[PDB]
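A reminder before we start the practical. When you read a complex entry, don't treat the lines as separate problems. The point of joint prediction is that each chain is placed relative to the others, so the output describes one connected object in space. Small molecules and nucleic acid strands, if listed, are placed in the same frame. In the example below there are 13 entries. Take a minute to note the order of the lines before looking further.
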Amino acid sequence: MLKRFPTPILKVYWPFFVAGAAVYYGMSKAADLSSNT
Amino acid sequence: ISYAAYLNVAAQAIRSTELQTASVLNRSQTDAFYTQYKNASEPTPITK
Amino acid sequence: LTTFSLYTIIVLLVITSLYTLTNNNNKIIGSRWLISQEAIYDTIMNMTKGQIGGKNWGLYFPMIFTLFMFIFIANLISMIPYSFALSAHLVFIISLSIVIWLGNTILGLYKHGWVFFSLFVPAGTPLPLVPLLVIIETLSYFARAISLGLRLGSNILAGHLLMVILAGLTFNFMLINLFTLVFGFVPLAMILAIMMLEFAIGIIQGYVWAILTASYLKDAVYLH
Amino acid sequence: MPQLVPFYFMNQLTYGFLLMITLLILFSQFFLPMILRLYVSRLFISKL
Amino acid sequence: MQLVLAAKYIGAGISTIGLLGAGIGIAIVFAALINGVSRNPSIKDTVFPMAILGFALSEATGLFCLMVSFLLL
Amino acid sequence: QLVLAAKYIGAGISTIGLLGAGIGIAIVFAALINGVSRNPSIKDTVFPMAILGFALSEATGLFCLMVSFLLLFG
Amino acid sequence: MQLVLAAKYIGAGISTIGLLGAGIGIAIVFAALINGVSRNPSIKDTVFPMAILGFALSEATGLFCLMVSFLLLFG
Amino acid sequence: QLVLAAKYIGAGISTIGLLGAGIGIAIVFAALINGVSRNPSIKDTVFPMAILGFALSEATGLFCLMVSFLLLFG
Amino acid sequence: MQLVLAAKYIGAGISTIGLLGAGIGIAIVFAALINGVSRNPSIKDTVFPMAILGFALSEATGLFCLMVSFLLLFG
Amino acid sequence: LQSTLDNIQSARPFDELTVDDLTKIKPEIDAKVEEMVKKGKWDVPGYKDRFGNLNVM
Amino acid sequence: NDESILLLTFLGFTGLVAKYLAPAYKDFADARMKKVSDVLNASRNKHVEAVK
Amino acid sequence: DPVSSLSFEPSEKPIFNAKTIEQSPSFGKFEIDTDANVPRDLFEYTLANQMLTAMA
Amino acid sequence: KLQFALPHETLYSEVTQVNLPAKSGRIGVLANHVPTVEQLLPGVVEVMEGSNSKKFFISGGFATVQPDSQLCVTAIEAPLESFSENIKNLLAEAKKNVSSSREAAEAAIQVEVLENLQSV
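Here is the predicted structure of the whole assembly.
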């Protein structure tokens, strides 16, 4: 039913994942700042 | 006056100008006097 | 656990059933359900083949497909009349747009250097307004960051709130004397029509996401 | 919808981004190639 | 009290103005339809779904205005 | 009396909304006359479509009118 | 106090006016779609994504008006 | 207080400016479709023109919006 | 004084209404460009300068408007 | 060839069979799929000219 | 209940879907299934000819 | 039709009506105004243009 | 490629710039042009192949850009130098003629030609 094959995705989507980490960190601080309302 | 009849009068006018030849004038001249026909029946020979 | 956490789980399990229990163990002729997700596959394949150049379209084709399917399911489940939104937590949708926008700009910077900023000189124009045409292009260029998300977010949020507000109004409208119970089918029919519209415009928004963030990638992957 | 502003945002967003990585991998490695399998199988039958 | 309630009523009144744009819009979709169909004849079966779509989208903008009116009341 | 005053004002503002439908109605019928004069014979098919559009353009104005009454009355 | 609350509600109403332009806008893109498609009978496959694009972009402007309406409405 | 009220009023007024830009975007896209339907094939030449036109129309709208935000937030 | 300060912020908003006109104007120039170039696809090199001139002038009317908003905002 | 004609009649999935069984009978299936997955092309050349593509655009 | 009105509209929507769409989608699916089968059987014929 | 300098084959063709112009499909792949009297003019123009050739 | 064709004077059977007076006002054709069908009105025509320009007086006809960039121009007769004084004399007669004298329509066409002559 399901055929798992390796797709190059780490070496395709690296700037996306890096951008994800920065915004993730920024949302930790944003959540903390919004809970101070 | 059909579209091509409209063009026809214009063409006829255009060859008169100073320079234009007899063969043009002949292309603008016609000897045919269309003998209209009808279902046999035949309205008399009349100029085209 | 959180209601939000539970609905992210519910979405994952729904999507799994669409690709496991969609074909009778695979046969040549296949099954009727998988024809739907075949046509979707092809109309988004031929769409990003229509947008993005190279075979780089197909390198970003899984991403453009799970951006279709996520939004397609999360604007169907959230329209169930006792279901708790994921998409109406705007912070996930807006963040996802900004992440993709930054991942396009970084991808563009990596791929096309600092001549990435030559993208914002679009064309040869009279020289005293070549910089003008950079300034009010770039201002709008990072308006692209929030526009993509905020379109989808506003539509879905407004759809759910619209339905609930009209339900609350017709409830208290039909509360009064029995002459309002009589002929309270015409406002009910109006709400039914509005509810029909909200499913449609939610499926349109998932598609609109996937064409627009193909257009942003068209610019980023191939300059001009 | 009842709760529109929590302050539970980073908690929410963590499960959200987790769902994104999960679905991305799931589609890319599993579910896209089984559709590509139908295409190729059909084309191989068409060929032979 | 009086002022806030007054403002609620005022805000609702102002909101009707937003709807007008959609109203003109709807007419434009149908005008295009009538012109198109009369021009082609045969386009109509393809074109009519597209026309319904354009109508629906226009209507949605107005709906947003309408719920804001109710909220302000 | 400020609340009562506001009701009468609010009704007035709501009336503005109707103008758009008035132009709109005309636009559909303009298209009708143009189309019908262009084709001649399209009319039997097109006329149901025309009435539908005509009604819809009016309906936007009707919403504006209903809100006028809602304010005016309360 | 009363005045600030009043002002928020008023400002929201005013913001609703902004949406009208998007309303006309969507129709204009669709009108062109109909006119083009009736002209060709066959342009549609190229034109359909273009038409959707124009719709979305035009729409987004009205949405901006709306969110400002919400910002003022809620405060 | 009067000033805080005035910010909210001012913000509302600014939002009106956006309507014209919205119409503007539609006009460019209408022309895109008309041009493509006219040529069958102008699309690739016209596409950078269309993006350019979109951006410039949008920019005027964006100015209305940022002025609105500036007044709202302060 | 609160009244005067208010007048600047209110008046700024009012100025922004004018800006809508410029938004429509730019689009009209572009509309002509696309239709025109379609009608003769070789006119483009002549027409594109004319178009940029028309854009610039239309934008300028918007600029003057936006300046009056900025004068109230920042001075 | 006599054998080949007989072989085609009594063995051939002329109704249907598992597509996995087609992979089992020819690794060519997996070979073409693997090269396309490795390439990242999801376009199958000529699949749309001898099967549909069901475009909604 | 407020939200029970919404549930009635949702029931009407799913009814309209089962009325209109489920037979249409059946027909759509059917059309495609036939086409796949027909291509398949065509290839089967094709190779039988070649042997002869 | 004067097929060769030593032969002649009598030949016929159908003259295109205004109706032809109207309902020909890739008439839409040419462009002129919908208020053009071009079918009613072009019919006439090609009535003669076809005929003149036939005579020639 | 350009094509000017006449039943007995077939001419240019694209040529750089062509300037035509057409039922659609005046039309210029340059390179690829959208494929049109236009009845050519009685005309003063300029056809330019390179910067060199050739000047035609054309009796009206039909114009058709074919999609393959063949500008089919068909006209009866043209060749504007040929058109050039006796025609003015005739046109004076034609002006007299319209007043009394289907002949009225003919003489009206002659007046149209007179306008075209004044253009020359």
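Discuss with your neighbour: Chain H has one domain: 1-74. What might explain this?
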